[PDB]
Design a protein around this ligand. Structure first.
Ligand SMILES: CCCCCCCCCCCCCCCCCC(=O)OC[C@H](COP(=O)([O-])OCC(O)COP(=O)([O-])OC[C@@H](COC(=O)CCCCCCCCCCCCCCCCC)OC(=O)CCCCCCCCCCCCCCCCC)OC(=O)CCCCCCCCCCCCCCCCC
Ligand SMILES: CCCCCCCCCCCCCCCCCC(=O)OC[C@H](COP(=O)([O-])OCC[N+](C)(C)C)OC(=O)CCCCCCCCCCCCCCCCC
Ligand SMILES: CCCCCCCCCCCCCCCCCC(=O)OC[C@H](COP(=O)([O-])OCC[N+](C)(C)C)OC(=O)CCCCCCCCCCCCCCCCC
Ligand SMILES: CCCCCCCCCCCCCCCCCC(=O)OC[C@H](COP(=O)(O)OCCN)OC(=O)CCCCCCCCCCCCCCCCC
Ligand SMILES: CCCCCCCCCCCCCCCCCC(=O)OC[C@H](COP(=O)(O)OCCN)OC(=O)CCCCCCCCCCCCCCCCC
Lengths: 70, 40, 175, 114, 99, 297, 98, 347, 88, 96, 83
């Protein structure tokens, strides 16, 4: 009967699965764990620019905390 | 009247200019015999 | 170099304008300005016009540009024209592009072209300002005031568009 | 039609707080309530004096007071802060919603220790 | 307006947005808010033609803010001399110029 | 690095669209007392490739009356705009986190009419132009319903940011709150998708569009949950939901006769539109009536 | 005044000339009309966004909703003219010579 | 046209004109112009003859173009002053563009081309509306920006208008064309005094408007469109042609008829502004208007013309339309000169 | 940067996909205008989600409901005077 | 159910915004020093680059007013490298 | 009575879609007028701060405004925390 559609849809299922999968992980790879900080408004953007300038390595995704001040 | 206006006809009295001739677009269509709905 | 990217958007905007203003086939003239419609949003987008830029694509590009292509698809003059068929349009085509290119070169040479208005050909990024926009998008919060401060335009626009409906049917009614 | 007078580097070289955005937002509420004495003064100066050059002294003082509070909590439960703020950045929009448990692990120290 | 009904009826129909320095949504200030406030307050109850002679430097200040033509010419002069100088082996930008 | 993701957003879709054709035939197979393609590889798995591999090998027979410029440009945009459609989809974290993704999604959906109009006008055939004339009139007709429906449901989200959609649904699927609009949208996406030589690309475009429009409905109404520490759970839930909706597209495509042209517009203007207007009016008053207006930030 | 203002200024100017240089097609001229007001649309946005005139952000939208609205008449007179004469040609747009 | 649909269609046309006169925001002015354009084409389209489609077309393309150019006069002024109010305009070319555009809405320079042509195709009653009600809104803007107008621009435009309007009227035989040509001529008088005190423009507007309602509505009751058709009217309606002739000299402007009311004060005002060649040309070429005025007068009532036998039929029946408000339009058009100082009320 | 890249790759992939596919081997008009006239009115109606978050919601309620009323009235007018009835 | 959840998000927005307005005084102070320090560096270069020009009194007041005016972002970075002007101008508009 | 009953019966028998749309639209037009939560809707909308709370100068005569942000004085939104 119909269980033969599953091989037909499974390929598309896996094929449709990669984009969301790929975006999920390389964002972690590019941004080091945390997601790419979304900037829907000016505030989140200049928050990011302050982070990038304060990192010193010129990378927002690198975060420095209480250890950074003495 | 001048040579330029020696042919300008006066406007129609009812302001309805002579209607244009037959401008119908009765398109002719062939629905087959290749059309599947034509049944071969 | 994306230093002068808005220059690139600005110049290709007008060459698209020269295209249809050269008066080719209406359908080919239509596509000649949808590209200009497409690039114009880019200029607004690069300036921060998210909603206004997307308006060009949605109501301008995806809206009434369709029915004009639709109208040409109705009329269908006994031969649909093309830039190739007319030789005068080619003469105007080259004239517009050359006139733009020379003035651009003059504009980028001494930055003091006084045609109609005196102006500076300096970089497009220069005119921008500083200061954060907070959490509110000024382009979106301003247009949202149409229902708060635009208490008059909605009345006239709503009345006019309804008046737009009656006039359309009445004149197309054919007595 | 005049000279644009602006301050010199001597008054501009001030100690700067060196932390990431998640550090600020994680302790923003507690910092806002306590470290407020210079913040209101500097903010009031900016609206009233309307001259960014005029409020330089208040601008350096609020950072200094923020430095005081930041090292003050370093005397205290920094590790609960450390785990709290290192989980805040994980969110794209940096919401406290996914970190309430870690938040409680942070406030309860300053709740009684301060 | 020709027959200004707003003044008699005391209702606002277009004055709310006719200038950039009036009340704005969420108190968002316009770019040249300070200069418009100065120019408008410079010329009130003074005359349509007295403003073009008295409140001139206020208007010139405001008109400069909105176009910034003179600043644009100023920065162009700065940049023109900059690359006219560095190209001849003259003064080299400090480290903070290039980052 | 970004280039990898863009390819990683296009290649698997193209493979998925390739295998949609096998799905389109075979899920209709046992739903027809049929078996579907089973001779071309195991369970017809090679049929996606086979059809996508033989069509390109055929010569591109273009009539001389057809202008080669438009006859090529119109198919080109028919896919390219349909390929950027997939981009702002809030699959865990979307590619471009546009603050106005809904407008970006719908506006590019408004340019898919140009592929049909030009490829029909350039053909210069009496059958072709009336077909293009029919298709352009239908799609632009359902455009007004598409936007009004979106305005109603999105009003309870907070802003046109597609990334905010997941947060809005969360606990409850938003189909529960706008089911009268849900079937309104599902019929609308069916009509726009045109689904009740240089051709494999067009079929791929009109089939990628089916998956996305189904995916757009999936993210809109048939929501899900997203754990920041395990986005893969949201991935599987999302692809499964849009797969089922694509199956429904196939389910009804083999369950109904066609719509006559007059009823095609009668259903929209005289039935769908006035009901859509009321529902939009309901969906704007209600958040105000209940003080449940979502935050813009 | 930068080039972004200027480039679209002559974009209107060539559009203004285009509508004022009827070749044979009023449809082509009509298509020149809305492109011409698009130059108005973009200038309106450019100035308003540049100066942060917050309340004036409505105006560019409502500029579209009337120019496009009158464009309906522009087609509507055209769609009726093409009936009696059989084409959009402005050469036949001289029946009212007297 | 359904009478209710016609009724509201005029209601918006007046509303659009009203919006122009009662607003200070430049953008609202453009809406008033566009809305008026939006709902007057159907008024021209009432009869739906191919001639009307011709004229209704010609009007739209000129009027739509004028609105667009007017719209940049808004944005360029905004671009160079950051203002939206109707005040002393703050940019030279922006003022030039608006004046060049507002004039086209009225028609003084060769922009006048559409005015006669548009009047010919469209009906007589729709003509009345076009020549008397529209011509208020474009003048409404001008009276408010007159302080900033380049004086040496409309004066050439007004001189060109009065010259061409009078010049062509000699050669016209279709009463609609004569009426429109005279309107162009009188509109030259409108704009000539405009840079100076605008109170005289309003007096010219009011006097001319009432003066052309009388001219048109008598023509409507005659149901005549050609000079010969008006000539035959002596038989059935001998008095109607007589009032037509009384309007004609007031049309021309010979005292004591109040058609000389506008011209007199224009000369008086423009003489106070050390302009004396300018009035002389206007008074001189204004005589050209009187020429074809007499020609139409000679055909109408001053002489008699060969009628037709079938006209005896019309003798038995009486007119049905009640010529609303007409009996005082004629009176307020001719014998108003003695009550001259009322212009002080206008300002 | 990111956006210009995204609108670049897909069009390039489309162009190559046709390269391998090319070198390897009144009433109908009337209903459209009605769409345009309604299309313009939905443009006014789009900014609603941000409009709902204004301080004076009462004025917003009247106008947002007003615009949809004119949507209905325009449709109802066209319907009752044939109009939306497509000529068959 | 949606009305309850939406009220929570409004509360969550309040908590988010209350975090921001506490952060403003420090951010305003930090950006205050940075913008005019960058301006001073601009005029320090201005003296060197405009040493030979006829009467360029370095530090001209653009406007007749004496009150401070926020600088145009054009002559704020200026001399800065290509990438700095790129990230500064179309940074937020292009980041995504 | 009978007139409206027959007419409504007539409408729902021939055009169920139309009456449903009118009922929903007609319903939605009146709830805000007597809505018991719209008063809350403006209150919470006015309680969302987008801009900075600008301090005002302290010279006495204003005991109503608090000194510290945690001070008892000033408006309180316990209703916001509850509804
Ligand atoms: C300054 C001093 C001097 C001026 C003083 C002020 C008076 C100015 C007007 C003078 C009279 C003009 C006139 O009627 O001439 C005859 C002339 C021809 O009359 P006609 O032979 O009966 O033919 C007219 C229609 O074709 C007939 O079409 P129909 O058969 O369909 O009948 C429709 C007709 C008959 O009326 C109806 O059908 C009634 C409809 C009722 C239902 C609607 C109810 C809701 C609206 C109620 C409005 C009241 O109604 C209309 O035509 C509607 C427009 C006029 C009434 C509404 C005006 C807006 C309010 O009138 C027109 O052509 C009307 C033009 C528009 C009004 C006058 C505009 C010219 C003056 C402008 C400048 C005014 C001074 C400015 C300063
Ligand atoms: C007709 C229905 C729509 C108009 C009436 C209901 C809305 C009234 C309104 O918005 O008034 C705004 C104002 C009164 O404002 P208000 O006091 O209601 O609200 C002010 C809101 N802020 C502070 C944000 C500006 O009235 C007008 O503008 C009159 C509009 C014309 C009315 C007559 C039209 C004919
Ligand atoms: C307090 C509550 C407030 C809100 C209450 C709202 C009112 C109650 C609900 C109203 C009815 C429901 C909404 C409207 C739906 C029908 C609209 C309509 O026009 O119907 C009549 C129409 C037409 O019915 P007709 O042909 O009998 O004619 C009806 C009347 N005239 C002639 C005027 C049109 O029905 C359809 O169009 C049927 C569907 C046609 C398309 C073919 C595909 C159908 C696929 C169905 C299966 C898949 C469903 C998927 C659902 C979504 C899943 C995610
Ligand atoms: C400024 C200079 C002058 C400008 C105006 C000049 C006008 C005439 C110029 C020549 C015109 C062309 C040539 C003649 C055309 C004649 C037109 C006409 O219709 O003539 C025939 C017509 C027939 O008359 P009929 O219409 O039957 O009416 C008779 C009176 N019931 O005749 C008529 O209809 C004539 C109607 C006459 C009506 C007379 C009314 C008299 C009222 C007297 C009131 C007295 C009050 C006294 C009070 C005292 C106490 C205070
Ligand atoms: C709660 C209190 C109210 C309860 C409901 C009361 C009103 C019931 C209305 C019933 C329907 C309208 C009347 C009617 O029977 O109209 C029938 C007719 C059908 O037309 P048609 O389908 O073309 O068939 C004939 C031609 N062949 O119809 C027509 O020809 C005209 C159709 C017009 C449709 C307009 C739709 C507008 C949008 C929906 C309404 C939105 C809300 C408007 C404000 C409502 C305020 C109360």
């Amino acid at each position: 009967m119909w269980f033969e559609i599953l091989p037909g849809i499974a390929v598309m299922a896996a094929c449709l699965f990669i984009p969301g999968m790929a975006t999920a992980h390389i964002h972690k790879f590019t941004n080091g764990g945390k997601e790419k900080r979304v900037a829907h408004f000016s505030y989140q953007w200049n928050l990011m620019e302050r982070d990038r300038c304060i990192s010193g390595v010129n990378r927002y995704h690198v975060t420095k905390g209480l250890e950074n001040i003495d | 009247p001048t040579k330029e206006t020696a042919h300008w006809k006066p406007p129609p009295w009812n302001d309805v200019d002579p209607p244009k001739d037959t401008l119908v677009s009765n398109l002719t269509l062939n629905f087959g015999p290749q059309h599947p709905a034509a049944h071969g | 170099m994306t230093m002068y990217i808005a220059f690139i958007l600005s110049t290709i905007f007008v060459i698209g304008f020269v295209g249809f203003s050269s008066k080719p086939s209406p359908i080919y003239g239509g596509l000649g300005l949808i590209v200009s419609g497409g690039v114009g949003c880019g200029i607004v987008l690069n300036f921060g016009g998210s909603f206004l830029g997307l308006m060009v694509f949605l109501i301008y590009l995806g809206g009434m540009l369709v029915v004009f292509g639709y109208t040409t698809a109705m009329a269908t003059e006994m031969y649909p024209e093309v830039w190739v068929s007319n030789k005068t349009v080619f003469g105007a085509f080259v004239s517009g592009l050359m006139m733009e290119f020379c003035m651009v070169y003059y504009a980028l040479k001494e930055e003091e072209v006084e045609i109609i208005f005196k102006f500076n050909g300096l970089g497009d990024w220069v005119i921008y300002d500083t200061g954060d926009s907070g959490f509110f998008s000024e382009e979106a919060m301003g247009i949202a005031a149409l229902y708060s401060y635009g208490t008059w335009l909605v009345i006239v626009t709503g009345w006019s568009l309804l008046i737009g409906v009656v006039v359309i049917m009445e004149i197309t009614r054919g007595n | 039609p005049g000279i644009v007078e602006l301050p010199t580097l001597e008054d501009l070289k001030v100690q700067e707080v060196k932390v990431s955005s998640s550090v600020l937002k994680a302790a923003a509420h507690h910092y806002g309530a306590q470290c407020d004495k210079p913040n209101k003064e500097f903010m009031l100066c900016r609206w009233e004096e309307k001259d960014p050059r005029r409020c330089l002294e208040e601008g350096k003082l609020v950072n200094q007071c923020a430095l005081d509070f930041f090292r003050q909590i370093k005397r205290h439960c920094a590790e609960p802060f450390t785990e709290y703020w290192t989980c805040i950045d994980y969110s794209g929009l940096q919401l406290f919603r996914h970190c309430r448990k870690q938040q409680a692990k942070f406030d309860e120290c300053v709740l009684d220790k301060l | 307006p020709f027959f200004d009904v707003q003044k008699r009826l005391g209702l606002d129909l277009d004055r709310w947005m006719t200038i950039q320095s009036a009340e704005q949504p969420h108190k968002i200030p316009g770019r040249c808010h300070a200069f418009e406030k100065e120019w408008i307050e410079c010329a009130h109850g003074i005359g349509g033609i007295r403003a073009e002679k008295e409140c001139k430097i206020e208007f010139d200040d405001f008109v400069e803010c909105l176009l910034r033509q003179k600043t644009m010419k100023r920065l162009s002069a700065i940049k023109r001399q900059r690359d006219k100088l560095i190209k001849e082996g003259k003064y080299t930008p400090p480290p903070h110029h290039l980052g | 690095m970004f280039m990898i993701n863009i390819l990683s957003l296009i290649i698997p879709i193209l493979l998925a669209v390739a295998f949609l054709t096998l799905v389109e035939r075979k899920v209709l197979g046992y739903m027809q007392l049929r078996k579907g393609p089973n001779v071309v590889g195991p369970y017809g798995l090679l049929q996606p490739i086979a059809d996508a591999l033989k069509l390109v090998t055929k010569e591109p027979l273009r009539p001389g009356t057809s202008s080669i410029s438009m006859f090529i440009i119109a198919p080109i945009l028919g896919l390219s705009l349909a390929l950027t459609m997939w981009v702002p989809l809030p699959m865990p974290y979307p590619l471009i986190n546009m603050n106005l993704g809904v407008l970006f999604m719908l506006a590019m959906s408004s340019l898919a009419v140009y592929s049909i109009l030009w490829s029909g006008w350039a053909s210069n055939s009496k059958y072709a132009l009336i077909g293009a004339l029919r298709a352009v009139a239908q799609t632009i007709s359902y455009e007004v319903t598409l936007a009004i429906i979106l305005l109603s449901v999105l009003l309870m989200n907070g802003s046109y940011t597609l990334s905010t959609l997941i947060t809005t649904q969360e606990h409850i699927w938003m189909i529960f709150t706008s089911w009268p609009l849900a079937m309104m949208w599902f019929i609308s996406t069916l009509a726009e998708t045109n689904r009740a030589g240089p051709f494999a690309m067009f079929f791929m475009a009109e089939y990628a569009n089916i998956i996305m429009m189904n995916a757009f409905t999936a993210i809109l109404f048939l929501g899900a949950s997203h754990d920041p520490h395990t986005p893969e759970l949201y991935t599987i839930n999302f692809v499964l939901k849009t797969l089922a909706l694509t199956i429904t597209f196939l389910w009804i495509r083999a369950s109904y006769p066609r719509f006559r042209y007059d009823q095609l517009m009668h259903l929209l203007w005289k039935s769908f539109l006035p009901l859509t207007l009321a529902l939009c009016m309901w969906h704007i008053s209600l958040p105000i009536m209940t003080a449940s207006i979502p935050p813009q930030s | 005044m930068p080039l972004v203002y200027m480039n679209i200024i002559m974009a209107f100017a060539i559009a203004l000339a285009g509508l004022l240089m009827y070749r044979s097609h009023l449809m082509s001229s009509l298509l020149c009309l809305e492109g011409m007001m698009l130059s108005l649309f973009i200038m309106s946005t450019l100035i308003i966004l540049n100066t942060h005139f917050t309340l004036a952000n409505m105006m560019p939208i409502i500029l579209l909703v009337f120019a496009a609205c009158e464009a309906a008449l522009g087609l509507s007179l055209l769609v009726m003219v093409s009936n009696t004469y059989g084409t959009d040609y402005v050469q036949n747009l001289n029946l009212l010579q007297c | 046209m359904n009478p209710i649909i016609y009724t509201t269609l005029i209601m918006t046309v007046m509303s659009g004109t009203m919006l122009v006169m009662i607003s200070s925001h430049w953008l609202l002015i453009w809406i008033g112009f566009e809305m008026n354009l939006l709902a007057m084409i159907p008024v021209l389209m009432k009869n739906f003859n191919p001639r009307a489609t011709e004229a209704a077309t010609k009007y739209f393309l000129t009027q739509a173009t004028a609105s667009m150019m007017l719209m940049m006069a808004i944005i360029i002024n905004l671009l160079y002053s950051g203002q939206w109010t109707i005040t002393k305009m703050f940019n030279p070319v922006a003022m030039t563009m608006m004046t060049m555009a507002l004039a086209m809405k009225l028609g003084l320079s060769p922009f006048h081309f559409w005015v006669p042509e548009v009047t010919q195709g469209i009906s007589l009653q729709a003509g009345l509306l076009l020549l008397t009600w529209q011509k208020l809104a474009p003048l409404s803007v001008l009276c408010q920006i007159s302080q900033s107008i380049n004086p040496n621009l409309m004066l050439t435009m007004a001189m060109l208008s009065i010259l061409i309007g009078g010049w062509g009227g000699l050669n016209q035989t279709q009463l609609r064309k004569i009426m429109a040509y005279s309107s162009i001529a009188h509109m030259g008088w409108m704009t000539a005094v405009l840079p100076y005190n605008t109170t005289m423009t309003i007096l010219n507007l009011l006097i001319y408007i009432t003066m052309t309602l009388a001219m048109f509505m008598l023509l409507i009751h005659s149901s005549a469109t050609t000079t010969l058709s008006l000539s035959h009217t002596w038989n059935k309606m001998p008095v109607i042609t007589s009032l037509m002739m009384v309007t004609l000299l007031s049309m021309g402007g010979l005292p004591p008829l109040s058609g000389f009311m506008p011209k007199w004060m224009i000369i008086q005002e423009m003489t106070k502004n050390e302009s004396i060649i300018m009035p002389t040309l206007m008074a001189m070429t204004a005589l050209l208007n009187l020429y074809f005025y007499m020609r139409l007068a000679y055909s109408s009532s001053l002489t008699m013309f060969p009628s037709t036998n079938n006209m005896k039929m019309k003798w038995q029946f009486e007119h049905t339309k009640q010529m609303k408000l007409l009996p005082t339009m004629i009176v307020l058009s001719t014998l108003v000169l003695p009550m001259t100082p009322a212009l002080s009320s206008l300002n | 940067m990111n956006i210009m890249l995204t609108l670049l790759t897909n069009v390039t992939l489309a162009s190559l996909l046709v390269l391998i596919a090319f070198w390897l081997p009144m009433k109908f008009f009337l209903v459209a205008i009605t769409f345009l006239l309604f299309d313009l009115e939905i443009a006014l109606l789009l900014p609603l989600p941000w409009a709902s978050q204004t301080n004076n919601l009462k004025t917003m309620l009247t106008m947002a409901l007003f615009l949809l009323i004119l949507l209905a009235a325009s449709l109802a007018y066209e319907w009752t005077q044939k109009g939306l009835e497509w000529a068959e | 159910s949606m009305m309850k959840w939406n009220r929570e998000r409004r509360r969550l927005q309040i908590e988010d915004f209350e975090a921001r307005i506490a952060l403003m005084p420090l951010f305003q102070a930090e950006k205050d020093r940075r913008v005019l320090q960058m301006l001073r560096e601009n005029l320090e270069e201005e003296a060197i680059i405009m040493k030979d020009v006829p009467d360029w009194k370095v530090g001209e007041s653009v406007f007749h007013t004496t009150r401070w005016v926020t600088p145009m972002m054009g002559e704020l970075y200026g001399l800065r490298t290509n990438e700095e002007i790129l990230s500064a101008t179309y940074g937020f508009i292009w980041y995504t | 009575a009978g007139r409206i009953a027959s007419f409504l019966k007539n409408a729902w028998a021939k055009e169920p879609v139309l009456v449903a749309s009118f009922a929903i639209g007609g319903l939605a037009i009146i709830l805000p007028s007597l809505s018991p939560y719209t008063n809350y809707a403006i209150r919470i909308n006015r309680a969302t701060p987008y801009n900075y709370p600008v301090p005002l100068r302290d010279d006495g005569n204003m005991p109503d405004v608090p000194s510290h942000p945690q001070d008892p004085q000033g408006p309180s939104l316990e209703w916001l925390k509850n509804l």
